[PDB]
Structure 1
Amino acid sequence: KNPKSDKFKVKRFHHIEFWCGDATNVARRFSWGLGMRFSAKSDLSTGNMVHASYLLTSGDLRFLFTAPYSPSLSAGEIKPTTTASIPSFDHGSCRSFFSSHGLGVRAVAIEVEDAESAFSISVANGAIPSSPPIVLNEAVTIAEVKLYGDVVLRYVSYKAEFLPGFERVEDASSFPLDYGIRRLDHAVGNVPELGPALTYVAGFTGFHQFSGLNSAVLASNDEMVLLPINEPVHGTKRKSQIQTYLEHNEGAGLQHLALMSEDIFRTLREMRKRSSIGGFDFMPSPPPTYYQNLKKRVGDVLSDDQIKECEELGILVDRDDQGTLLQIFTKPLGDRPTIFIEIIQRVGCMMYQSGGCGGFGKGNFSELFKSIEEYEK
């Protein structure tokens, strides 16, 4: 049941922005670990005296890494005279975000038809404004409203190359890394109370509903913008990982980013080769029991050798009434046990592939738990 109630025209996920202490080192680490190319920059070399911003791309996935310079470089500036390429940026906000949360996502950006009307309609419908619409070089419009915690939903609209003021990166500094990641599938928030979080976001977007936690998913009209939200379930045997998140993050924020791969086998081979030489680490692999039980539940989707390849790579598998999902989770991206990355690939729901095909893997909590018990046996 999709009532298609978006209060404005939403296209696709556009980019994700990390607020960093040093954007150079985070961006270089992420580039090597995920196989993303350096594609654009805005920094001192492009005349930006306010912040350093570096853009990584893989397919349609766009990761932006931003950190503030010393405020003294831009002391004589005012907003009308700013050299910042992202005019919503504020030194004090960025330093306070990072001191409070550590490394994390500041902005979940979606491309819309008209960011100004998206901003107006959202605020008229209960959204808390964060940054008003601003038109950059008569070409791009950006605006921001609060999503949860200190994370903003950023609207971007183009009249007709990332953002004005960003320069394309010279091919020499731009090595064409690619491990097969192609787009952002979904972005997940952790909140203390799911109910009010859902009501707030669904209220101002018109997005419709699609051990440890309760969860629900908000989706755009074509269900290609997917925003799950989690809350903790207290008193449990094992402590809720959502609760641990809220403690170490100093409250609500983005929990994980799910990146669709065109070939999750190759992506995981390439990422695992680099885990211990600067890349990302992965969750411990499920026991062989789990892969033994895969034949019975997806043996009509995946061959034995594709199942054995899932086993070599530590991949999880879940299935809907409509599709099959292959997924794996990284360890936390930085110092705090907060944000992590999910790699996914979806099988089925051909029409193009409909969004969310196969679900989000919630069947794996019990399937992994069972298999852990069966391996102890």
Structure 2
Amino acid sequence: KNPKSDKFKVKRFHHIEFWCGDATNVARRFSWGLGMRFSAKSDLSTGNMVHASYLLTSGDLRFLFTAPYSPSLSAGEIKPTTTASIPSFDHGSCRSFFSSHGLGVRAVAIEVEDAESAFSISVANGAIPSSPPIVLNEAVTIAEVKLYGDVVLRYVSYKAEFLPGFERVEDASSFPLDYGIRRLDHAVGNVPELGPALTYVAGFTGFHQFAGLNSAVLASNDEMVLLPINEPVHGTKRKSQIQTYLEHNEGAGLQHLALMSEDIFRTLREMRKRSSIGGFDFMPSPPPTYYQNLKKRVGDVLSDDQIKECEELGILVDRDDQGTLLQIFTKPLGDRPTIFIEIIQRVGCMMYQSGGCGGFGKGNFSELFKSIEEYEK
């Protein structure tokens, strides 16, 4: 059931912005680890005296990394005279965010038809304003409301290249890395209480519910914007990873970004080659019993050779009533056991592929558990 109740016209995920201590080092690490190319910049060399912002892209996936300069460089500025390219940026907010939470996502940005309308409608329907609509070079409008914790939902709308004031990055510094990642599939928040978080976000967006934790998924009309939210379940045998997150993050925040690959086998080969030479590590692989049990579960979707390739790369498989999901999880992206990345590819639900085809892999909690005890034999 999709009641299509969006209160404003939403298109797709647009970008994810990380708030960093040093944007250069995080961006370079992420570029090599994920196969994303340097696409745009806004920094001292472009006249920005306030913040350094570097954009990585892979396909339609856009990762922005931002860090503040010394406030002294912009001490004579006021908002009407700012050299910042992202007008919502604030030195104190950024330093406080990073001190509190460490490296993590500040903004989940979605493209909308009209950021000013989306902002007004959101706030009229309960959204906590974070940054009012600001028109950039009469070409792009950006606005922000609180999503959960210190994460904002950013609306961006275009009259007609990332943002005004950003410069495209010269060829020599833009190595065309590509490991197959193509778009953001979903972005997941951890909160102390799921009910109030869902009511708030669904309240101001009109997003509907999509068919050690409790979780639920909010979706836009065409179910291409997907925002799962998790709460911890206390008292369990093993401590909830949601609760560990909330402790080390100092509260609610973005838990994982799921990145769709057009070839998850190639993506994982390339990322795993780089794990120990600057890239990302992956969670421990499932036991062989898990891949033995895949024949009964998805033997009609994946061949034996494809199942063996899943085993070689540590890939997990889950299945909907409609589609099949291939997924795998990185270890945390930074010092704290907080944010991590999921790589996914979906098969089925062809009409284009409908959003969320195959689900989110919740069935892999039991399948992993069963395979572990089975393997303990």
Question: Could you say whether these structures have the same fold, taking a TM-score greater than 0.5 normalized by the shorter chain as the test?
Answer: yes
Superposed CA RMSD in Å reads: 1.0
State the secondary structure of the residue aligned to 1:338: coil
State the secondary structure of the residue aligned to 1:312: helix
In 2, the alpha carbon distance for the partners of 1:347 and 1:86 equals 37
Deviation at 1:233, TM superposition (A): 0.2
Matched-pair identity in %: 100
**Paired positions, count:** 377
Deviation at 1:44, TM superposition (A): 0.1
Deviation at 1:141, TM superposition (A): 0.1
Deviation at 1:345, TM superposition (A): 0.1
In 2, the alpha carbon distance for the partners of 1:211 and 1:187 equals 17
Deviation at 1:278, TM superposition (A): 0.0
Deviation at 1:150, TM superposition (A): 0.1
Aligned to 1:275: 275
In 2, the alpha carbon distance for the partners of 1:140 and 1:225 equals 20
- The alpha-carbon distance between structure 1 residues 206 and 328, as it changes in their structure 2 partners (threshold 3 A), is same
In 1, the alpha carbon distance for the partners of 2:10 and 2:272 equals 35
In 1, the alpha carbon distance for the partners of 2:243 and 2:174 equals 40
Q: Deviations over 1:230-254 (max 9, x none)?
A: 0000000000000000000000000
Partners of 1:211 and 1:365 within 8 A in 2: no
In 2, the alpha carbon distance for the partners of 1:76 and 1:337 equals 39
In 2, the alpha carbon distance for the partners of 1:160 and 1:3 equals 30
Aligned to 1:355: 355
Partners of 1:317 and 1:325 within 8 A in 2: yes
Partners of 1:261 and 1:267 within 8 A in 2: yes
In 1, the alpha carbon distance for the partners of 2:298 and 2:76 equals 63
State the secondary structure of the residue aligned to 1:165: coil
Superposition misfits of 4+ residues, deviation over 3 angstroms: none
- The alpha-carbon distance between structure 1 residues 250 and 267, as it changes in their structure 2 partners (threshold 3 A), is same
State the secondary structure of the residue aligned to 1:267: helix
Partners of 1:215 and 1:228 within 8 A in 2: yes
In 2, the alpha carbon distance for the partners of 1:211 and 1:6 equals 16
Partners of 1:207 and 1:220 within 8 A in 2: yes
In 2, the alpha carbon distance for the partners of 1:12 and 1:283 equals 29
Aligned to 1:210: 210
Give the gaps of 5 or more residues in structure 2. none
State the secondary structure of the residue aligned to 2:171: coil
Q: TM-score, normalised by structure 1?
A: 1.00
In 2, the alpha carbon distance for the partners of 1:201 and 1:332 equals 26
In 1, the alpha carbon distance for the partners of 2:115 and 2:195 equals 27
Q: Deviations over 1:17-53 (max 9, x none)?
A: 0000000000000000000000000000000000000
In 1, the alpha carbon distance for the partners of 2:287 and 2:134 equals 52
State the secondary structure of the residue aligned to 1:172: helix
Q: Deviations over 1:278-299 (max 9, x none)?
A: 0000000000000000000000
- The alpha-carbon distance between structure 1 residues 223 and 70, as it changes in their structure 2 partners (threshold 3 A), is same
Q: Deviations over 1:103-155 (max 9, x none)?
A: 00000000000000000000000000000000000000000000000000000
Partners of 1:60 and 1:182 within 8 A in 2: yes
Deviation at 1:12, TM superposition (A): 0.1
In 2, the alpha carbon distance for the partners of 1:76 and 1:6 equals 42
Q: Deviations over 1:181-230 (max 9, x none)?
A: 00000000000000000000000000000091000000000000000000
Aligned to 2:161: 161
Partners of 1:58 and 1:182 within 8 A in 2: yes
Aligned to 2:52: 52
Partners of 1:211 and 1:236 within 8 A in 2: no
Deviation at 1:64, TM superposition (A): 0.0
- The alpha-carbon distance between structure 1 residues 211 and 235, as it changes in their structure 2 partners (threshold 3 A), is farther
- The alpha-carbon distance between structure 1 residues 211 and 159, as it changes in their structure 2 partners (threshold 3 A), is closer
Deviation at 1:329, TM superposition (A): 0.1
Give the gaps of 5 or more residues in structure 1. none
State the secondary structure of the residue aligned to 2:40: strand
In 2, the alpha carbon distance for the partners of 1:216 and 1:46 equals 42
In 2, the alpha carbon distance for the partners of 1:171 and 1:15 equals 22
Q: How does 1:43-82 map to 2 (within 5 A)?
A: 43-82=43-82
Q: TM-score, normalised by structure 2?
A: 1.00
